[PDB]
Amino acid sequence: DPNLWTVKCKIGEERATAISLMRKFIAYQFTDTPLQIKSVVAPEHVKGYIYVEAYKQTHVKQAIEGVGNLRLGYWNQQMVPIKEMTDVLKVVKKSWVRLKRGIYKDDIAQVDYVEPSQNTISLKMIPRIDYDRIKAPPQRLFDAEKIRSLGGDVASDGDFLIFEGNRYSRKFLFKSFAMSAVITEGVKPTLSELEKFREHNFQPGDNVEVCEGELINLQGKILSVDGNKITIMPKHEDLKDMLEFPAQELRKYFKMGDHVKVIAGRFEGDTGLIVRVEENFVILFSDLTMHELKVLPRDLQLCSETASGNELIGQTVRISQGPYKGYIGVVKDATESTARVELHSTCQTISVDRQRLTTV
Amino acid sequence: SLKQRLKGKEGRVRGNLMGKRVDFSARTVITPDPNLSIDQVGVPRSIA
């Protein structure tokens, strides 16, 4: 079986390299200078280099001769190892989308109307424009009055509007964009985007108990953390061994009278001490105020940090009295009593009384 | 690099920790004077 060899190519032009190599193979398949290679691979997501399938490196070198896009891999070739050849062809994989190209790249767009022609869909966007004022930008609301005032490419239909490169807006952009120009899988917007248009959090050092199983009511401190099945190693009371517990079995249990913080919800950012631990209602008093804050056991964490909660200046003067009489200078500094005069004649700045100075 | 930032005669250990720039210092030409004692230096006014 032949082997795969890496050939460095021009970035972004790997598919065209394979097309050109196929055309070259077909154009010389009956001549006296045949391409003795077997196949050419240019993957979808591997950018920078392609692969040549051959029994020899010399075959690869004599086959890529005349191809300028591969000139940076012409002198030397590197073979893909035998065990890694299957990794070459291995492939892994009213809504919201995010635009791919343009100034609206990766911006949340509400899919308004799906056009059944499978070419484009109507998208609701927040304009990243300067209203034709700076260009001869963050997301802000579409101001139709400002774009009617500044003029330029603008057409008004009440709240409907066309502007600046056939951008369609209403009341909020409503413009068509291609399905292949958007990502229709894996956006998951947040609550702030809902206004515009389970979970596990275990931390090292926190205290947790066991709610079910044969190891119930064993409270231990958290050492490590993982994603879904954590296989935690808690340091229990009076046990030198490290046991194993997943996330569904544990719960953030805290003894009464300890440092507590709130991770998320309405009560986040506030600290304090808990008072009495019920089945799930855990009541606490804050470090700032003495108001009762009742929280879920999961919305608590163990953190030991403290809660946050003159006129003569620059005036050409003339010394009219004293040893320096008759000198013209410029006042650098001045006081109630004296003033420093930069003499025009000498390379020296000297201080004299204001009673000795006479302005020009 | 960091090793190049430390290893030199212009690095941190010689250049900045051993011999460093200091405030309250003056540098000007010396000219002779036989009318002052051996432990007296005549400094200018603009330096003083």
Binding site: I19, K38, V40, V41, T86 | -
Partner: protein
């Protein structure tokens, strides 16, 4: 031949049966260069839209499938040289698959992707 090779990068589509990658013009004018006799997408655009894919990953310029280990892993050794797709997203309707099976052609999926 050169008739199989696509002419440009725009509207490249991979076949659902043999993962043959061609432009929509070449599918409209030539059909499938391997198994059009079993599919008959020549002279019909809707047949092409039903029998070709708009989502593919990776291309292979299979030049000599008779002596290629890639053709052994992708099961395209008994075909003709051309541009093939590694991963193909899509599926034929049940009528076409049943008609192919009635002609002795079971439809093996070219979707060799590792879905999570």
């Amino acid at each position: 031949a050169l008739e199989t090779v696509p002419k440009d990068l725009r509207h490249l589509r991979a076949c659902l049966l043999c993962s043959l990658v061609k432009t929509i013009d070449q599918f409209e004018y030539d059909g499938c260069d391997n198994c059009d006799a079993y599919l008959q997408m020549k002279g019909n655009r809707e047949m092409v839209y039903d029998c070709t894919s708009s989502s593919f990953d990776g291309i292979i310029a299979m030049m000599s499938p008779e002596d290629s280990w890639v053709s052994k892993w992708q099961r395209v050794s008994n075909f003709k040289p051309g541009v093939y797709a590694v991963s193909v997203t899509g599926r034929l309707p049940q009528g076409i698959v049943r008609e192919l099976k009635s002609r002795g052609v079971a439809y093996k999926s070219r979707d060799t992707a590792i879905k999570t």
